[PDB]
């Protein structure tokens, strides 16, 4: 039998995330008669942000009230975005089902609390939580790539950012990946033994960060590169074994089912934080 089953559950990204990672647009929702694409991943995406080309405006800046505006909610009364963690807990202090949620889930629910159809609609905005200043940013624009030209990426500037869809589960800490696995190599459990991934796509990478960056670029995407049939439902090159000695990022698109002990390797995924190890 496979003793890795329970442990490896969080790396069945297709099952626990269930949507795009690089570009998450796994659901649709109607607003005033018109259908719109929507992020719907169940796991947070650590280190993911949006790079705005040509323009010098960062994407956490409020949307234009176009090149001078970002992706986030404009000022409101009362100010709902951006809102600190303590601000959110205070805002929902009378709601016992919400006030004690973890910062990422709370941020997801907070953004999902704002109904644009002012009838009930299913449209809930995605959100970014910035661990740096503990702020939740509600994203007014759900788009993630257009090549107003922009694209998603892991980046040093985005390492404390966390991209959150409306479906972020409240137990992501338990069932979703975050940290990279040090001295460990993803593998496939076969006949009572953990075997290597039989086929991988080798990309050179200077460090773990650059490997995680590459895995993200090649990961599940709900929108074809260079701009429903487009839904990945979590399928893609979501995993990577990084050999830190040979500086090889070994990227593959089948779920791992066990770990191999190897001090030359670090196990990463597209969802995982680009720095943190355990």
């Amino acid at each position: 039998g496979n003793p890795w089953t329970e442990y490896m559950a969080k790396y069945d990204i297709e099952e626990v995330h269930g949507s795009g990672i690089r570009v998450d647009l796994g659901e649709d929702a109607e607003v005033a008669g018109t259908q719109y694409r929507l992020p719907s991943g169940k796991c947070p995406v650590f280190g993911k942000g949006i790079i705005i080309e040509n323009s010098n405006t960062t994407f956490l800046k409020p949307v234009a009230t176009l090149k001078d505006g970002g992706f986030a909610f404009p000022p409101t009364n009362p100010l709902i975005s951006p809102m600190t963690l303590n601000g959110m807990r205070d805002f929902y202090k009378n709601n016992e089902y919400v006030k004690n949620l973890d910062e990422l889930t709370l941020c997801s629910r907070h953004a999902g609390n704002m109904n644009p159809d002012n009838k009930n609609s299913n449209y809930k905005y995605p959100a970014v939580y910035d661990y740096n200043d503990k702020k939740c940013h509600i994203l007014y624009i759900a788009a993630q790539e257009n090549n107003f030209c922009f694209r998603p990426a892991k980046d040093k500037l985005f390492e404390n950012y966390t991209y959150l869809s409306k479906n972020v589960v409240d137990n992501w800490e338990e069932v979703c990946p975050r940290k990279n696995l040090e001295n460990a190599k993803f593998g496939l459990w076969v006949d009572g033994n953990c075997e290597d991934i039989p086929h991988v796509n080798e990309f050179s990478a200077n460090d773990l960060f650059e490997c995680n960056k590459l895995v993200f670029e090649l990961s599940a995407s709900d929108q074809p590169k260079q701009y429903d049939r487009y839904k990945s439902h979590g399928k893609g090159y979501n995993w990577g074994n990084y050999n830190r000695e040979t500086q090889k990022c070994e990227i593959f698109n089948v779920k791992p089912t066990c770990l191999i002990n190897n001090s030359s390797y670090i196990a990463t995924t597209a969802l995982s934080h680009p720095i943190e190890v355990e």
Binding site: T76, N77, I80, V98, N113, M114, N115, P116, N118, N120
Partner: peptide, 13 residues
């Protein structure tokens, strides 16, 4: 303007 889904419902403009 938006309307909160969770009670108590309010409007945010």
């Amino acid at each position: 303007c938006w309307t909160t889904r969770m009670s108590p419902p309010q409007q945010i403009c």
